Design a protein around this ligand. Structure first.
Ligand SMILES: N[C@@H](CCC(=O)N[C@@H](CSSC[C@H](NC(=O)CC[C@H](N)C(=O)O)C(=O)NCC(=O)O)C(=O)NCC(=O)O)C(=O)O
Ligand SMILES: N[C@@H](CCC(=O)N[C@@H](CSSC[C@H](NC(=O)CC[C@H](N)C(=O)O)C(=O)NCC(=O)O)C(=O)NCC(=O)O)C(=O)O
Lengths: 219, 219
């Protein structure tokens, strides 16, 4: 009777964030796969402004934007170990890195599998620099959240599911460039929340050609 | 001791947010005008990732990104009413609208004063549609924050200082399109925090031609 619905699209690293946050809080939810090429009434009713997934619907009330949903989850299901720190400065730094990930990672990553030529190579270069900036922030910590798996980890880890695809389509190795970020990603995939929520990496690889066709990309 | 330094640029609607938040809290701060064409060592040290103003420096600790700074300010210093609601759902709605403003308003507004031709006319049209969306959200409420002036009001009000400029350089009338949004803006500029923080609309108009030259825009 506390009802939680998640409107989502399986390979979305953004939706993965809200799957993971929910699993971390042990919240039971109803996952509803959406067709973004034939948008459903419920998606169009719940996110009228942007018409995007994920949408988290809690007792009929929609919360849009994946990072906003992580924070809402953290506040509504509070725990001994919070996803966001209570210290205001440390909270602001977590928000900063979430904002950074939203601004930077996807746009460069998309040029790896979804473009060709000069644009593609410039996208690969920028994507690696962005990862190195994140790897420098992580430093020698277990998680971006320090000893605890937190907001920034959740913000980034959905992208990890696509790393095999980025390596394949960009003919390069992320482990060679960012070994510590790889070690971090392996650690996070050992968590139940993450292992449950991320699709298989090969499934993503298999889907890229179909996805390219659906997005009008000819490669 | 408590030291609050704000690295800023006078006509920035992003920096205006942080000025207004600090004034709502009655905080004593040191405002430090920055030359974005000859960036200072402090700006570069305090915002190494983006190298952008505003930067809020609290006892030597920097906080980057204007909306993040409003939230930090709200958590750190007391006021009669908070800038963000304590209800998680309302808080998430406020975040939603702040994110919407950051994603949409500037990119269209920039085409009004900073472009010519088809691009300019399309920018004016999109800017109007964005304002109408915002005006529908506001509805018949006194503030976006309902009865209390808050986060969303602060997120948008800096752009109000530029409306006379947008109408002049776009040869159009926002009041004709969005009268309730104009009423809102007039109401907010009566708040002492806002009146102290916004430049004179005329000072902005007088600056546009210089600003165009500095940005390499020929009009
Ligand atoms: N900030 C929101 C972002 C949520 C979001 O983007 N949701 C979309 C699906 S997540 S898969 C990544 C996405 N891809 C698409 O949107 C595919 C279709 C789109 N037409 C495209 O060409 O990319 C993406 O990030 N794309 C790039 C871009 O946005 O510039 C979604 O629901 N899309 C529906 C749509 O019609 O676009 C959050 O964090 O929640
Ligand atoms: N999200 C941050 C945004 C803070 C930010 O953009 N700060 C810049 C000053 S605010 S004035 C509007 C700004 N204009 C510029 O950046 C001028 C120079 C720029 N090179 C340009 O041509 O636009 C803006 O919004 N520009 C549009 C854009 O950035 O896409 C700032 O410090 N700029 C420094 C710079 O070198 O760019 C927040 O909310 O705080």
């Amino acid at each position: 009777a506390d009802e939680v619905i998640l409107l989502d699209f399986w390979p979305s690293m953004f939706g993965m964030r809200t799957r993971i946050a929910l699993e971390e809080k042990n919240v039971k939810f109803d996952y509803r796969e959406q067709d973004l090429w034939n948008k459903s009434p419920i998606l169009l009713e719940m996110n009228p402004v942007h018409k995007k997934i994920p949408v988290l619907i809690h007792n009929g009330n929609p919360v849009c934007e994946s990072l906003i949903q992580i924070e809402y989850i953290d506040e509504v299901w509070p725990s001994k170990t919070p996803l966001l720190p209570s210290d205001p400065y440390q909270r602001a730094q977590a928000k900063f890195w979430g904002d950074f990930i939203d601004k930077k990672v996807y746009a460069s990553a998309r040029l790896i599998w979804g473009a060709k030529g000069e644009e593609h190579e410039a996208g690969k270069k920028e994507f690696i620099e962005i990862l190195k900036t994140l790897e420098s922030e992580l430093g020698d910590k277990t998680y971006f959240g320090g000893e605890t798996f937190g907001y920034v980890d959740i913000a980034l880890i959905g992208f990890y599911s696509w790393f095999e695809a980025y390596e394949k389509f960009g003919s390069f190795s992320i482990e060679a460039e960012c070994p510590k970020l790889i070690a971090w990603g392996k650690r996070c995939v050992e968590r139940e929340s993450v292992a449950k929520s991320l699709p298989d990496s090969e499934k993503i690889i298999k889907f890229v050609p179909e996805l390219r066709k659906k997005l009008g990309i000819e490669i």
